[PDB]
Amino acid sequence: SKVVYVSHDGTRRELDVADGVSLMQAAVSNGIYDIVGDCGGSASCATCHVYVNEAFTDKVPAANEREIGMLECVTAELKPNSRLCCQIIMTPELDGIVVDVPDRQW
Numbered sequence: 001s002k003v004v005y006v007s008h009d010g011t012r013r014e015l016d017v018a019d020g021v022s023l024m025q026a027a028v029s030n031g032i033y034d035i036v037g038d039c040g041g042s043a044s045c046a047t048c049h050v051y052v053n054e055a056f057t058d059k060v061p062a063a064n065e066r067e068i069g070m071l072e073c074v075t076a077e078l079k080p081n082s083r084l085c086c087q088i089i090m091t092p093e094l095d096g097i098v099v100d101v102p103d104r105q106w
């Protein structure tokens with residue numbers, strides 16, 4: 001699947017995350033999450049704070065309270081589709097996901 005994380009000013013990245021990969025995985029593979037915010041899928045960090053375009057949040061796995069927690073933890077432009085790529089799985093239908101990165105990615 002196609003993946004394009006955006007920045008706060010709009011600058012984005014572009015991976016190729018397939019069905020089963022989390023944009024966080026691929027992103028941390030193309031050098032997207034160059035930072036050190038990995039909770040081993042344990043949902044205990046806040047550096048993976050991001051925003052998946054509304055066309056890939058309800059298409060990809062719309063995680064529950066867990067993702068709404070660490071996400072609710074970030075201190076940036078939270079959204080209805082706010083997300084921490086750690087669980088946004090890229091599928092073959094969501095080929096072309098647009099992710100949004102905030103300026104407050106604590």
Ligand code: FES
Binds near residue numbers: 043044046049070084
């Ligand atoms: S990788 Fe830790 S919650 Fe996103």
